[PDB]
Ligand SMILES: Nc1ccn([C@H]2C[C@H](O)[C@@H](COP(=O)(O)OP(=O)(O)OP(=O)(O)O)O2)c(=O)n1
């Protein structure tokens with residue numbers, strides 16, 4: 001027959017072969033399964049939404065297809081059979097993008113050895129290399145749950161009524177989580193301040209937190225810690241952990257943003273701008289007032305959002321349970 005998506009299929013085929021011979025035959029199935037669906041398609045796929053609707057392609061496969069599509073250019077060097085398996089090897093290193101991967105490829109790096117030994121490495125990328133095998137795998141939902149309770153009970157020792165919620169893939173009801181994003185705040189809006197610094201070292205001492213990506217990131221009034229953790233006991237693997245501390249005022253919108261999905265967020269922002277608003281991770285606020293000619297005449301004000309439901313209300317949307325916002 002005739003295959004419209006020739007470009008996507010060739011890369012996915014070389015990609016699938018590499019994974020089966022490298023040990024993962026589960027994912028090579030996903031690529032192979034995806035390839036058959038792609039071949040039997042009337043038109044060339046060039047977008048995310050279109051890739052998701054196709055029978056046989058999941059919403060985590062679509063993101064992978066998009067990555068390949070966006071990073072196609074230049075594809076000038078060598079051939080796909082020798083480049084792509086090496087490109088993916090560097091791509092899966094944490095804190096390394098496709099551009100950083102092909103960059104290392106241009107320099108002449110073919111193994112993870114060459115990356116560690118010679119290549120320039122971010123403070124982030126170094127950590128990924130150390131825990132690369134463990135970072136290649138998603139974690140079961142149950143493992144994410146006891147990580148949630150670990151951070152939760154560790155923080156609640158400081159403040160009894162302190163609230164900790166997992167907003168990653170976990171909250172969306174996903175069966176597997178690449179990482180676990182823990183959001184922490186307090187109902188009064190008073191208690192959350194200062195907890196961040198005195199909790200990290202508390203968790204670091206017990207051997208729970210192994211490495212730190214960013215010691216502390218200050219965005220507005222939000223605190224973010226990117227890092228790595230390992231559960232106690234034998235046979236435990238290292239899981240990347242993201243902690244975000246927000247004021248209770250921004251909690252509803254921070255909850256919604258971090259909850260997901262990524263494409264859901266993008267769709268929410270796109271919808272918010274059509275109703276004359278803007279949806280950040282801080283608060284749902286009215287869009288900047290502009291005259292007819294597009295000149296910025298007025299500042300946008302912040303709307304009060306105490307609950308996650310009120311955000312949906314103000315956007316004229318019927319509420320959607322986290323399981324139903326996995327786009
Ligand atoms: N470019 C991005 C990345 C993330 N997020 C938001 C939505 C995500 O759900 C959330 C957490 O980021 P993750 O990288 O952890 O995404 P997921 O948890 O949903 O998937 P994964 O299982 O790989 O962690 O942050 C976003 O809005 N835009």
Ligand SMILES: [Mg+2]
Pocket residue numbers: 167168169170177178179180181
């Ligand atoms: Mg997550």
Ligand SMILES: [Mn+2]
Pocket residue numbers: 091092093094095096097
């Ligand atoms: Mn990566």
Ligand SMILES: [Mn+2]
Pocket residue numbers: 179181242
């Ligand atoms: Mn994350």
